[PDB]
């Protein structure tokens, strides 16, 4: 049975985001309406945050640190085209200052 494969090949786009928090988690809501893909990849370390979802890219330096312990929680609303991620704070109770002022990094 003969086989034919075809791969199709594009500027990265900065998505709109809203940041909220409680004593335990920092939540990032990223709207990706032009959801070409439904696969979303998140990388975080210390205060560094990176989100990939072609053609969307968003990088942020957070005012505080996030810990890697599998308690982080991602979810997606198709009705609104919104991906939401909960990141547990490294120091619980710590209040992140200047959240609503954060700029996308290049």
Curated annotation (Swiss-Prot):
Where in or outside the cell is it found?
Answer: Cytoplasm, Cytosol; Nucleus, Nucleoplasm
Report the superkingdom from the record: Eukaryota
Q: Give start-end of the signal peptide.
A: none
What residues does the CS domain cover? 12-100
| Job description of the protein | Required for the quantitative accumulation of H/ACA ribonucleoproteins (RNPs), including telomerase, probably through the stabilization of DKC1, from the time of its synthesis until its association with NOP10, NHP2, and NAF1 at the nascent H/ACA RNA.
Q: Which disease is it linked to?
A: Dystonia 35, childhood-onset: A form of dystonia, a disorder defined by the presence of sustained involuntary muscle contraction, often leading to abnormal postures. DYT35 is an autosomal recessive form characterized by the onset of a dystonic movement disorder in the first year of life. Neurodevelopmental disorder with dystonia and seizures: An autosomal recessive disorder characterized by global developmental delay, inability to walk or speak, profoundly impaired intellectual development, and early-onset dystonia. Additional features may include other extrapyramidal movements, seizures or seizure-like activity, and cerebellar hypoplasia on brain imaging.
Subunit structure and binding partners:
Directly interacts with DKC1 alone, but not in the context of the core trimer composed of DKC1, NOP10 and NHP2, nor in the presence of NAF1. Does not interact with NAF1.
Give the UniProt family note.
Belongs to the SHQ1 family.
The protein's name: Protein SHQ1 homolog
Q: What is the lineage of its organism?
A: Eukaryota, Metazoa, Chordata, Craniata, Vertebrata
């Amino acid at each position: 049975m003969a086989h034919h494969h075809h791969h199709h090949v594009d500027k990265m786009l900065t998505p709109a985001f809203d940041l909220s928090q409680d004593p335990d988690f920092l939540t990032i809501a990223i709207r990706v309406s032009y959801a070409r893909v439904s696969e979303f990849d998140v990388y975080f370390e210390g205060s560094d945050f990176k989100f990939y979802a072609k053609p969307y890219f968003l990088r942020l330096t957070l005012p505080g640190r996030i810990v890697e312990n599998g308690s982080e929680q991602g979810s997606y609303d198709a009705d609104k085209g919104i991906f939401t991620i909960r990141l547990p704070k490294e120091t619980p109770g710590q209040h992140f200052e200047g959240l609503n002022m954060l700029t996308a990094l290049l």
